Structures are given as structure tokens and as C-alpha cells.
Amino acid sequence: SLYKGVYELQTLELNMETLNMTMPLSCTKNNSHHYIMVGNETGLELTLTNTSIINHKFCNLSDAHKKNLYDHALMSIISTFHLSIPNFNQYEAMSCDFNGGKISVQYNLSHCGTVANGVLQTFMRMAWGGSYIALDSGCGNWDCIMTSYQYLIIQNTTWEDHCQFSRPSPIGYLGLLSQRTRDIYISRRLL
Amino acid sequence: SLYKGVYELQTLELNMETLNMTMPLSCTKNNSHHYIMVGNETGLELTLTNTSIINHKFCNLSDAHKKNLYDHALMSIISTFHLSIPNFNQYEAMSCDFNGGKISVQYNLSHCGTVANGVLQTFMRMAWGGSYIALDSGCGNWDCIMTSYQYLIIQNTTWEDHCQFSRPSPIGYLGLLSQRTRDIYISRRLL
Amino acid sequence: SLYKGVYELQTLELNMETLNMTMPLSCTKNNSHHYIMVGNETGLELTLTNTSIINHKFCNLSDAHKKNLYDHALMSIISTFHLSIPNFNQYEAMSCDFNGGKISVQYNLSHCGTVANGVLQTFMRMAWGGSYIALDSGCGNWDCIMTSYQYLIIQNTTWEDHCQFSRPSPIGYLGLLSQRTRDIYISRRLL
Amino acid sequence: GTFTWTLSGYCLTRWMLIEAELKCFGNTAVAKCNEKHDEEFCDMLRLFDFNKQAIQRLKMSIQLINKAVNALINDQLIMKNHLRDIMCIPYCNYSKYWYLNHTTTGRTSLPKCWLVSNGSYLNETHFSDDIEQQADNMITEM
Amino acid sequence: GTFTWTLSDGYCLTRWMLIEAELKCFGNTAVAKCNEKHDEEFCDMLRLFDFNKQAIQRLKMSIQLINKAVNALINDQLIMKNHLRDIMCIPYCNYSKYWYLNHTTTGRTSLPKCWLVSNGSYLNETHFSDDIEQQADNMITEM
Amino acid sequence: GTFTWTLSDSYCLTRWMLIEAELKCFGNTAVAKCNEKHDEEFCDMLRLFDFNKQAIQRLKMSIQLINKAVNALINDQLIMKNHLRDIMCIPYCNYSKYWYLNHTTTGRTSLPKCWLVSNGSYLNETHFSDDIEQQADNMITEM
């Protein structure tokens, strides 16, 4: 409506998808699948599931770096994800393959003051739009955040136009960059 | 008291104890003993003493993370303490134990330009109100501050009325919390 | 010769050599052989050459921390440089030589988006002001810098009359101070 | 540090907004950008300007945005919005913004973000007091 | 990354936010000045107290929330500036005993600026009285 | 987070800081624009040199001090943004030379701004004097 007879309310919605060849775009598909997209050809897929894809507890990070067949941007996003997570103490709760340049990671997720709170916190900060539907706690729950799903899987996929229930939104990743080294426990004497 | 015949001077002695629950409150007791209070019924007791308690060179950090018996907030504070040291290279200085969920750390101290300078500087920045009495000279020297005490032993403790001399002040902890990884010596080619 | 009648346009040139004592400066005297000075009689030399001096692929840097002989400021600058290399993913493409406090850190530089690109980006950004001549890249190929030379070397040196080609400028080092630990690839789960 | 990137009056092309309008803003709106820090708009303007400059003045890597994030945007504004999200305070996911258009001369204020809650854009009558405040501030033209 | 946190209630300090004194309510002009001014400590303490209040009310013992939100709720270089002053034996502020200037006739209130401290004791009024006079000279221009 | 350092009483540049000039001293007034503006390059150099001055006088080799004070003294993101200009072909600033409009009669000087650099040389007045015209219009706007 017109305010003070002369001042009308007119709105503008930003077409956030047009930042696609410059920086990552995070969007949702449903309560499970949340798609991060680096460019217009490749991206990451974050899925909370009760079914696992990696059945072993090893993680060949150093050998993956030595061989170096993976994509640099996807590994950069996964590094930002794993560094941003708070109070990560149980090394056994993560697995990864990186087999022949693959990207697959699996955070074991099976209460308050556990690693699941950090995993879901990083997940909702990354994919901001779907946090309403991915999270079972509703609103007002911060410390004791914990979902019903038993694993958080990360894979690499292409762009099949899977952004539904939320528009492209780089706000999560861009905001999460500054959270990279805010909270990590010391792991050894010599840094 | 009246200034310019128009305005008068007043004061606001803030109560920092209201901020107990939100973040840690760092206070003093005397030259040796300084304290950090996290919420209530828990906190750290950082003391400078000549009598060692650990008397061994190991530091069970990875095992403590695996067992996960410690308290998360105190471990976060100690991680912020250790990372905040400007130049830590001698890993033999630090010696810690967390047997059965305990928390205790000991920074061994012994012309200038040694790790004790960094340890005592981060100690001052932690106990930032009223800790000037630790030194022999509390002025005219910051880069080469030395103390007569041989060990800085950090311990967890219950919540008694330890605060004395300086009053509770969360400013020091938040000051350290920004400078966590601003100056760390590399130890590995791959980070 | 005035703008709008009553304004003289008086120019001011500022001398940054005055800041030599309390903070580093950086300059250039060749296509190769760029320089950093901590104060007088102490600095690092970024010799960007085509012949190696350290064929030994073993860095052995923790042992340098064990025998505390290296200058702390020079090691701090080395850590700032190495931590500021974007997406560093090959430990093999780096060599060191610490012996009696000596500092001699080599970066191998032998497609678009390799380790050499990150090394050269951080090298330009440290020695900003006279690094344009060093690297053959143009204006719109920042994603990957190609250079005919094949090795970068960082060596401690006493301060002679360097800074012949470019004026001293501390801007690059202060820029890299914010760059520390911002873009690092995870290599261990617990960090 | 603080955001510092300057805007190359800014008009947003039809590509970078919905409904395909020029939406050319006045010089005063861009003037407010440099001083104000805690306003969600003038943050996306910097991102879109940097987008255009990077596309046109440089011949697919996310290292550039990693370098330039803190120089471009106020990350802590995004953090304030997240803190509003967790506390069940209405917040802004940087999607839709609203300005007061003066139809007599076409001058418009700097747009403020449309706050959200419970997965729905907030009712315009809920924050109408803020709209009246913006009207009152805009009446102070001279 | 700048401070980004609103204040709501002219913010008025309650009984528990200051020792042995009554509520100290300030005009909205001071809060509007806090919105713009960066190098001010009392505005940061207002932000911290508001954040604590909202933490008790809107949320239900970890310290991770402030561990993330410190850069939003503290200017973070005022602490660094005061530390740099303290190490150099210069007067500094330890974020206590803030002083202001309230008008008895109209009830108007200034923005509280910190009371400096040196040598481990509170710094006398005469030593920085010219700063108070400068604040008063600025405030007569507010007419 | 945000720059906060404040000047020392006199602050103005001297022969220890200029190339050729001798005691090119500003009036120490109408310089609080630095406290308001954050895109200015000259302001960061003023604060950095003032910090160097106190570093020489107050304290007595180690570069820990600048490592701690880099965020408190200078807007590092302005360095990042001018470096981003350096990546592109746009004119940039390398923090060396500055310009200011000095009034003739009263002698007041505007806040200095960096002289932009392109092709390894300082810019000509054409394509850049429009900024000088806008600045002069700002000076006429002062009253």
C-alpha cells in the first residue's frame, strides 16, 4: 500500500543464480538432499541417510593429496566443512574414499554434547534454506541439535537442476568461510 | 562536581558476574593463582608454581580425544590458550594428563627469547585484569617478560569464591579468542 | 594553476623505509632475488632461480624446533609464507635445510591450477611492488601463473644494499598476515 | 577487517533480479552504502559488482572468492542473521528487499531486506513501524 | 567483519548489570551513536549484556555460541588497542566504571566513555579532565 | 575485526616520514574523517607510523608486536581490495604517494587520498581529475 500518499512499497528479488561461475551456490532438494554447486558442471551433494556408502573407517587424505586426481574446488569446500565443525574429537566418526579422484565422505552420526551437534550445525550453516526441513528440532534448539538420520554423506555430482524448496544461496558458504578455524581442539603438542 | 554549570559527572561500575553463563569469566586471586569460571560449578585454575605435579614429558591429547571423558568447554579454553602462544616450538615444555576425564596441563619454564615469554604473555592476556603483580617489573617490558616461577600448571576446579584482587572480567578470554592461529610455526609441509 | 579557484593540489610522497625497525619490509633488485628485511643486518632472500641447491626432499623441520637455533622472526615469516600458499597439496614439491639455525626453504615449480600457481601467487603477494617483472603472466590469467623459472628459494641473509629496483613496501607481509590458515587442505581428521 | 569494495548510483541488470526491471537506484542510495555497516543491502551489490568485474575483466576456481570474501562482504552480518535464525528471531536470508518509491519524482530509498520466519516472508504489517520510520527519515530531504 | 548486533528494550541497564546502583536509562540518541561509532567500549558492553539477556531468554553448559559470535558481539580491536596501551604503560581501559554526563535540568544523558586506568589503580579526574571538557564542548553543539 | 587505533597528540608527519619535504605537518584538526571512513589508505599509514613512533619510544629482535597489532592498526581488507584491483587492469594504489587539496588563504587541507598507479607509473590528471573535481565540490559543500 501507499505510505504517506506518495511513498509506495515496491520490492526486488535478487536472481542469486547468476553468481554461478564465480563462487559456490548452495540450494536444497528436500529434507535429505542439499546441493552445493561450484560451477555449471560439478558440485557436491550432502545427504542425510540411514544407509551408508563407505563401510570402512579409514580415510586416505594424505594419499589423496599425493596422487591428486580430485577436483581442487570440491576438496576446498570439504576442507572448509571439516575445519568449520566445532569440537571434533572422535576421529573414528568420519570415513572417506577419494578413490581415483573421487570425493565421497561419510560422517558417522549415531543427546547433547556430542559430535552430531557439530555435524548438523555445519550442515545447516552450509545449506541454510533446507535447515527448516532437514532438522527435526524445530526452532530454539542450539546446543542439543540432533537429527534422526544416522549418517551424513557427501558425494560429487553434476548439475541436473535439482534445486527445489529453496533458491540458490551462497550466503551459507560465504558466511562459513570465516568460521573455518574458530573452534578446533589441539591434537598434539607441536602445532 | 558540576562541570560548566550545565552537566555533572557520574560512574557505571559494571557487574560482569551476570555474564557467567554466556561465556567464561577470568579473574585473579593473587600473584600466583588466577581463575576462569565457565557458567558455574566448574572452571580452570591457572597457577604459577615451582612445585611440579606432572613430572613426565608425555601429553595424552589424542588418547584423551578418543576417550572423550573430559569437559568440552574447558578443553576449548585450553586449546585457545595453547594455540594463542605466539611462538611454540619446544614440545618438551608442555606436559598434560587427562586420566579418567581429568584435565591438567603444565608448561615447563626455564638469556631471553624463549618459550616462557610466549607462555607468560598468553597468561597475562588470559588473566588480563590485575595480573600485573606476577612480574618483578610490571612496566617497560613486554617482549622479554620473565617470572620467578618455574611452572604454569593449569587445572580444573570447582566453583568456590576464588575471585579476589581483580573482579570477574570476560574481556581477556574474548581477546585471546581472536588471536588463536595468528602466529603458529609450521610443523608439517602438508597442513 | 588551482582547482575551483582557491585550492592547490599539493602532492605527498611517503617514505616507508622508516618502518624498518619494528616490522618487516619487502623490496626487489632483479627479476629474481627479491628481498625481505626484518630490521637492519637481518632478512630473507626470495631467490627465484632455475637451479636447485637442496636436492634432499626431506624437510626435517620438527628437528629444527627441537634444537632452537633459527631466528624467530625469520621462521615467523617462513610460516606466514607457507601457511599462505593457497591449496597446497604436494609435500614432495618442497624441500628445506635447517642446520645450526640456517633457513633454506625450497619450493619446486616444475597445467593451469598446480602447486606452482599458488607458490607464485603468494610470492607476488609478499613482494608486491616489484614482482611484476618477475612473473611472465599478464593481467587476466590470475587463476594460474606460468613462469619460465623452475625453483623458488628462501634463504637467510645479512642486509646488504638491496632494494635497488623497487622501493621498500611492507604491504605484502601485512596482507599475508590475514591470509594465514584461511585456505588449507585438510590432511588429518583431528588437525 | 571491514568491507571496502567500491561500487562501479548502481542499476541492477534484468539478469540479476526477478521480474526483469532495471531498478536503477539514485546516487544517495549508493552513498549510504559506504558508511552503513549493519544493513543487508549494499552487501549483495558488492557481490554482484565483483561478479561483473571478475567475468568481464578476467578470462572455474573458488580461490578468488576465498581471497576476497572479507574484503567484499561483512561476514558477521551473515552471522547476525544466523544468530537471529537459531533464536527464532525474524531474520534475512538475503532473498527479497523492499524500498519506498517516491512516485512524484521517482526517488527511492535504499532497500531494506524483507525479514522471514517459519519458512515464509514476514507479514508487511508486522514491521510497519520500520516503514514509517524510513518514511520519516526520507522526508528529511534537505 | 564488523560488529553487527541490534539493541532493544533506549537501552536501560538493569539492576544486575551494575554494582550497587539503580537502573541507568539512556536516551535513544546515545544508542543511535553506538550504531555508528566503532571505537567505543560501552557500546560493546551494551551488546554483550543484550546478548547475554537474549541467551537466557530465547535459549535454554557449553560456551560454543559465544565462541562463534564473539566477532559479532565485540569490536575485538578495542581489546587489542587497550592491551597495546597497557603493555606500553599508557593509560588504558579495563571495561569498568564507565563515566558519562547526565543533564540535571532535562534528564538528558551522554554516551558513557570509559574511565581510564593506569598503574593498576583508577586514573584521577584531573588528569583527563580536558577530555570531559571536550565531550561537553561537543555536546553544547548538539543543541 | 574492525580497525580501532587512535592518534597521538601533537599527530602529523615529519622529515622522518616524507621523502623530500621537511615537517609537512597537518593542523591536527578535521582529521577525524579517518575515524569515520574505512576506505582511506593514508589513514592506515598515519596510524601505522604513529604506532611505529610509540614502538620506538615506549618499548626497546622480534616481529610479534606487528603480528598482533596488524588488525588493530590497519584495515587489512583495504590492502586485500587494492590488491584485487592489482589483479585486474584497473588503476590501483601501492601506498606510496598521496594527494590533497590545500586551500590557498585559510590553508586548510583535505584528507589525502592515494595517487593511483597504472602501467608501473602514476596516473595522469586526465581520467582521474574528475575525482579532484568531486573532492573540491565536497570542500565547497562544507558550509
Ligand SMILES: *[C@@H]1O[C@H](CO)[C@@H](O[C@@H]2O[C@H](CO)[C@@H](O[C@@H]3O[C@H](CO)[C@@H](O)[C@H](O[C@H]4O[C@H](CO)[C@@H](O)[C@H](O)[C@@H]4O[C@H]4O[C@H](CO)[C@@H](O)[C@H](O)[C@@H]4O)[C@@H]3O)[C@H](O)[C@H]2NC(C)=O)[C@H](O)[C@H]1NC(C)=O
Ligand atoms: C609505487 O608505484 C610507483 C609507480 O610504479 C613507483 O614509482 C616509481 O618508483 C621507482 C622506484 O622507486 C622510481 O625510480 C627511481 O627514480 C628516482 C628519481 O630520483 C631515481 O633516483 C631512482 O634511482 C636512480 O637514481 C639514483 C640516484 O638518485 C641512482 O643511484 C640509481 O641507481 C638510479 O639511477 C638510475 O640511473 C642511473 C644513471 O647512471 C643508472 O646507472 C641506474 O642504474 C638507474 O637507472 C629510481 O630510478 C620512479 O621514479 C618512481 N616513479 C615516480 C613517478 O615516482 C613507486 O616506487 C611504487 N611505490 C612503492 C612503495 O611500491
Ligand SMILES: *[C@@H]1O[C@H](CO)[C@@H](O[C@@H]2O[C@H](CO)[C@@H](O[C@@H]3O[C@H](CO[C@H]4O[C@H](CO)[C@@H](O)[C@H](O)[C@@H]4O)[C@@H](O)[C@H](O)[C@@H]3O)[C@H](O)[C@H]2NC(C)=O)[C@H](O)[C@H]1NC(C)=O
Ligand atoms: C629505519 O632505519 C634507520 C636505519 O636503520 C633507523 O635509524 C634512523 O636513521 C635516520 C637517518 O636519517 C634518523 O633520522 C634523522 O637523521 C638525521 C641525520 O641527518 C641530519 O644531518 C644532515 C646534515 O646536516 C641534515 O641535512 C639533516 O637535515 C639532518 O639534520 C638526524 O639529524 C635526525 O635527528 C634523525 O636522527 C632516525 O632518527 C633514526 N631512527 C632512530 C632514532 O633509530 C630508523 O630507526 C628506522 N626507522 C625508525 C625511525 O624506526
Ligand SMILES: *[C@@H]1O[C@H](CO[C@@H]2O[C@@H](C)[C@@H](O)[C@@H](O)[C@@H]2O)[C@@H](O[C@@H]2O[C@H](CO)[C@@H](O)[C@H](O)[C@H]2NC(C)=O)[C@H](O)[C@H]1NC(C)=O
Ligand atoms: C633428515 O632426517 C632424515 C631422517 O632422520 C630421522 O628424522 C629426523 C627428523 C630425526 O628425528 C632423526 O633422528 C631421524 O633418524 C635423515 O636421514 C638420515 O641421514 C643420515 C645422513 O645421511 C643417514 O646416515 C641416515 O641413515 C638417515 N636416516 C634415515 C632414517 O633416513 C637425513 O639425513 C636428515 N637430513 C638433513 C639434516 O639434511
Ligand SMILES: *[C@@H]1O[C@H](CO)[C@@H](O[C@@H]2O[C@H](CO)[C@@H](O)[C@H](O)[C@H]2NC(C)=O)[C@H](O)[C@H]1NC(C)=O
Ligand atoms: C549463471 O548462469 C546464467 C544463466 O542462468 C548465466 O547468464 C548468462 O551469462 C552469459 C555470460 O556468461 C550471458 O551472455 C547470457 O546472456 C546470460 N544469460 C543466459 C540466459 O545465458 C550467467 O552468466 C552465469 N554466471 C555468471 C557468473 O554470471
Ligand SMILES: *[C@@H]1O[C@H](CO)[C@@H](O[C@@H]2O[C@H](CO)[C@@H](O)[C@H](O)[C@H]2NC(C)=O)[C@H](O)[C@H]1NC(C)=O
Ligand atoms: C557408525 O556408528 C555406529 C554406531 O556407533 C557403528 O556401529 C556400532 O559400533 C559399535 C562400536 O564397535 C558397536 O558396539 C555397535 O554394536 C555397532 N552397532 C551396530 C548396529 O552394528 C558403526 O560401525 C559405525 N560405522 C558405520 C560404517 O556405520
Ligand SMILES: *[C@@H]1O[C@H](CO)[C@@H](O[C@@H]2O[C@H](CO)[C@@H](O)[C@H](O)[C@H]2NC(C)=O)[C@H](O)[C@H]1NC(C)=O
Ligand atoms: C533412521 O533411523 C532412526 C534411528 O533408529 C529412526 O528414528 C527412530 O529411532 C528411534 C531410536 O532413536 C526408534 O525408537 C524409532 O522407532 C525410530 N523411528 C522409526 C523406525 O520410524 C528413523 O526413523 C530412521 N529414518 C529413516 C528415514 O529410515
Ligand SMILES: *[C@@H]1O[C@H](CO)[C@@H](O[C@@H]2O[C@H](CO)[C@@H](O)[C@H](O)[C@H]2NC(C)=O)[C@H](O)[C@H]1NC(C)=O
Ligand atoms: C565424481 O567424481 C568422480 C571422480 O572424478 C567421477 O568418476 C569419473 O567419472 C568419469 C565420467 O563418467 C569416468 O570416465 C571416470 O572413469 C570416473 N572415474 C572414477 C575414478 O570413478 C564421477 O563421474 C563424478 N560424478 C559422480 C556423480 O560420481
Ligand SMILES: *[C@@H]1O[C@H](CO)[C@@H](O[C@@H]2O[C@H](CO)[C@@H](O)[C@H](O)[C@H]2NC(C)=O)[C@H](O)[C@H]1NC(C)=O
Ligand atoms: C549468573 O548469572 C545469572 C544471570 O545470567 C545470575 O542470575 C540472576 O541472579 C540474580 C541474583 O540477584 C537474580 O535476582 C536473577 O533473577 C537471576 N537471573 C537469572 C536469569 O537466573 C546469577 O546470579 C549469576 N550467578 C553467578 C554469581 O555466577
Ligand SMILES: *[C@@H]1O[C@H](CO)[C@@H](O[C@@H]2O[C@H](CO)[C@@H](O)[C@H](O)[C@H]2NC(C)=O)[C@H](O)[C@H]1NC(C)=O
Ligand atoms: C623443565 O625443563 C628443565 C630444563 O629446561 C628441566 O631441568 C632438567 O631436568 C633434567 C631431567 O630431570 C635434569 O637432568 C637436569 O639436570 C635439569 N636441569 C636443571 C637446570 O634443573 C626440568 O626438569 C623440567 N621440568 C619438568 C618437566 O617438570
Ligand SMILES: *[C@@H]1O[C@H](CO)[C@@H](O[C@@H]2O[C@H](CO)[C@@H](O)[C@H](O)[C@H]2NC(C)=O)[C@H](O)[C@H]1NC(C)=O
Ligand atoms: C576435574 O574433573 C575430574 C573429572 O570430572 C574430577 O575427577 C572426579 O572428581 C569427582 C568428584 O570428586 C569424583 O566423583 C570422580 O571419581 C573423579 N574421578 C576422576 C577419574 O577424575 C576432578 O575432581 C576435577 N578436579 C577437581 C580439582 O575437582
Ligand SMILES: *[C@@H]1O[C@H](CO)[C@@H](O[C@@H]2O[C@H](CO)[C@@H](O)[C@H](O)[C@H]2NC(C)=O)[C@H](O)[C@H]1NC(C)=O
Ligand atoms: C641497526 O639500527 C640500530 C638502530 O639505529 C642500531 O642500533 C645501535 O647499535 C649500536 C651498536 O652497533 C649501539 O651502540 C647503539 O646504542 C644502537 N642504537 C640504539 C638507538 O639503540 C644498529 O647499530 C644498526 N645496525 C647496523 C648494522 O646498521
Ligand SMILES: *[C@@H]1O[C@H](CO)[C@@H](O[C@@H]2O[C@H](CO)[C@@H](O)[C@H](O)[C@H]2NC(C)=O)[C@H](O)[C@H]1NC(C)=O
Ligand atoms: C622438482 O620437480 C621436478 C619435476 O618433478 C623434478 O624432476 C624430476 O626429478 C626426479 C628425480 O631426479 C626424476 O626422477 C624425474 O624424472 C624428474 N622429472 C623431470 C621431468 O625432470 C625435480 O627433481 C624436482 N626437484 C629437484 C630436486 O630437482
Ligand SMILES: *[C@@H]1O[C@H](CO)[C@@H](O[C@@H]2O[C@H](CO)[C@@H](O)[C@H](O)[C@H]2NC(C)=O)[C@H](O)[C@H]1NC(C)=O
Ligand atoms: C528465503 O526464504 C524464503 C522464505 O522461506 C524463501 O522463499 C521461498 O522460496 C522458494 C524457492 O523455491 C519458493 O518456491 C517459495 O514460493 C518461496 N516462498 C515464498 C513465501 O515466497 C526463499 O527462497 C529463500 N531464499 C534463499 C535465497 O534462501
Ligand SMILES: *[C@@H]1O[C@H](CO)[C@@H](O[C@@H]2O[C@H](CO)[C@@H](O)[C@H](O)[C@H]2NC(C)=O)[C@H](O)[C@H]1NC(C)=O
Ligand atoms: C580495573 O582496574 C581497577 C584498578 O586496578 C580495579 O579496581 C580494583 O577493583 C578491586 C575489585 O573490586 C577492588 O578491591 C580494588 O579496591 C579496586 N582498586 C581501586 C584502586 O579502585 C578494577 O577492579 C578493575 N576492573 C576489572 C573488571 O578488572
Ligand SMILES: *[C@@H]1O[C@H](CO)[C@@H](O[C@@H]2O[C@H](CO)[C@@H](O)[C@H](O)[C@H]2NC(C)=O)[C@H](O)[C@H]1NC(C)=O
Ligand atoms: C598548505 O598551505 C599552507 C600555506 O601555504 C602551508 O602552510 C605553510 O607551511 C610552511 C612550511 O614550511 C610554512 O613555512 C608556512 O609558514 C606555512 N604558511 C601557513 C600560512 O600556514 C601548508 O604547509 C600547506 N599544506 C601542507 C604542506 O600541509
Ligand SMILES: *[C@@H]1O[C@H](CO)[C@@H](O)[C@H](O)[C@H]1NC(C)=O
Ligand atoms: C529427496 O529426493 C531424492 C531424489 O533422488 C529422493 O531419492 C529422496 O527419497 C527424497 N527424499 C524425500 C524425503 O522426499
